[PDB]
């Protein structure tokens, strides 16, 4: 039976590391007009603009290409005890992935 | 009725695992489902730290170890009840996943409430909805927090009125007066899948079990 | 009905001691179920509190071994222009892939960080990824 | 308040009553109708009255007082509806469903 | 289990950027 | 009858609460007025219920008329009910010091036919619960309200000898001086028994309050201590 | 609004 611990230990979100500046793959799920929320394997989804060259292509199911920056949005505020969450990642859409 | 007691409420009680809710998961399957995953360290509540395993690059991991126990408790706790015909109340405030727990509490023959939480509802039950009403034996919340990170008003509306509570808690939440919380990620689509499917399918094997039992007395 | 002090015991301890002091006629549904099987903790309000001083909250943060290889990949060779599909359980990254290599020749060799950092990057060349510095 | 009761003996007495209107009318009780009711009481208790409530009327009972007190649980308590606890299961089960069309639009004069 | 995690100052830590006159008299 | 003094409304009965809209009747439980104020004109009463058997509760009630004001008190006092826990149903676990706000209170467990030796409003809160023999003393600012939340949170927050066995995992046995060297055995625990002895602290590092020690050694003088009073 | 009627 494998244990959690090695489970996070060989898991791929690990592996990754530091999530600044990693080129991940999204799937987007949802569409609002022209803002496209995309899954990339992470625990919040990243809400990204849908680009003015080939727009048709990015539709629902479809696999894009991400530069991450933060997995979460997260600050402190003045006069705060617990940082506000947005709950949300900060990612750049680059493409589509071929 | 003393035999009809003694050989149909009393006798689930003797058994560990009656309704047999240990197959229903295993930690490889939460893992799967991303329920180990909590929020930054800087969102962590207090009263959470001991379920969490620790922080990678400040994020930090819920120890799946203790969700399966706390998941298997709450389980087992909602199948008995649902064996006994209790009244089962899901709650959540996370609009994404409103519809989902409508049609699930819909699907196992239970209640849903997703909406804006009137103040008095479990507290002033009475003139919200008349003399006789019958409140609910068990509250199942999917999400404890409302949308403005602050505790969902019914937890403490329940623990007022003596309503035992199955709740998700994720790390930024507080699990003081969840009779029977779930460390377990509260946010990712995945999870909360996972959770709907798990306790809609207890509930329904419960309800079954409880027939195939009364059918069986009946006949022998 | 029961008791309405949510901040005194819990909802058993109440319960229970209004049933033996005859307040209550009868049990609620849950309360067997409850006495059979019990929660790990018993649901008791507590406030929660700041810390100050030298108390410090008891989490870990989560680091292995191989953490410090993969820091010096990504500080020389660079983030890998191959994108991470969290998704696929079992992906493999080029950093994965030198990492495991390191292990190896590490396991079957000596131990000079500089020595299996070279011997990796020329290896990993011999079996044919691009590993632009 | 009106009482179950009060209003099943309402209903049987306004039974008796339709069957002796068709009978005084001449007309045949198992087709006797409502607008035939409106029109022999009419007939036979004239009043020029220009409010149009207050002239004499025989009205179902279900029609006169108000039955909008429908019950949303049973004998065993558990409530019919898996939105009573919201208070406007109506209301919030038409949104449902109205939600739930839109999601399945998405996957694939007048007032 | 050799699985744990173990103790050790953060790795991914981009050592402090000497300044260009660093080392020069 | 009448209450503290002649003209106090305190010490009051109000009678059994009235029939709640849960259903329940509460005839075995009996009321008493705590404190009575005019706010301003409204009345605001601080009133105490109890069973005699260890449930009782205390409630605040608001309203122009003094009746309605009752009335409210004590059907949310029945609503909010303590659990006290009593030794053999007389006293209480153990001494209990505690300080609410600016109001102090030490209570002592005291043997059988000791009595009520206890502030007034005290002496009506344990008949009310059920304590028969206690010991009270009320220092600092004398606040009815205060003295009231004091006294059952301090109450509420006795352990009993059971949980001291489980906690500790050992036999808590009972010395009685007019049952001679004769050990009684009051609490066992569920679980296992320890076999290591508690460590014999040969000094205690306790923290002991001045007026019991100057009582102890015969240097309290006072002419109003252990007065001659009637049967509380 | 992404979950408009929820
Ligand atoms: S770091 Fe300051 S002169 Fe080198
Ligand atoms: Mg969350
Ligand atoms: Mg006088």
Redesign the pocket.
Known sequence: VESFASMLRHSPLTQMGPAKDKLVIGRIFHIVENDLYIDFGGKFHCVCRRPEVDGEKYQKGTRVRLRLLDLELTSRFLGATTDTTVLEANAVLLGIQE | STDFNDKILNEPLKHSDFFNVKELFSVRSLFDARVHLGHKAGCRHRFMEPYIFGSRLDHDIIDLEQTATHLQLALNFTAHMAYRKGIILFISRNRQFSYLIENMARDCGEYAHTRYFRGGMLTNARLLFGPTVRLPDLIIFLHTLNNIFEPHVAVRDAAKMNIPTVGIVDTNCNPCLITYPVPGNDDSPLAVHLYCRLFQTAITRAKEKRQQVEALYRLQ | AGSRLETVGSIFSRTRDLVRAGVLKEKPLWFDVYDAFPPLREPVFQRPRVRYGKAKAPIQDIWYHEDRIRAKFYSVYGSGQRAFDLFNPNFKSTCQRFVEKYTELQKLGETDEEKLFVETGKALLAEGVILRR | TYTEDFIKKQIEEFNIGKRHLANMMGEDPETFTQEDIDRAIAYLFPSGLFEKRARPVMKHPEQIFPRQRAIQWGEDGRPFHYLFYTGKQSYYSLMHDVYGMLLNLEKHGSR | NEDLPISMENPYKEPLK??I???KH | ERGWSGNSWGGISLGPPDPGPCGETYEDFDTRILEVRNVFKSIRVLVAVGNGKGAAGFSIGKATDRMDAFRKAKNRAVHHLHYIERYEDHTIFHDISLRFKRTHIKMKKQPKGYGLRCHRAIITICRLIGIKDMYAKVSGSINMLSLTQGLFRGLSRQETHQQLADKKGLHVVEIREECGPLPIVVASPRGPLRKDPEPEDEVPDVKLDWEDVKTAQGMKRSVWSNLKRAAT | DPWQGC
């Open positions: 000497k300044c006159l660093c080392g």
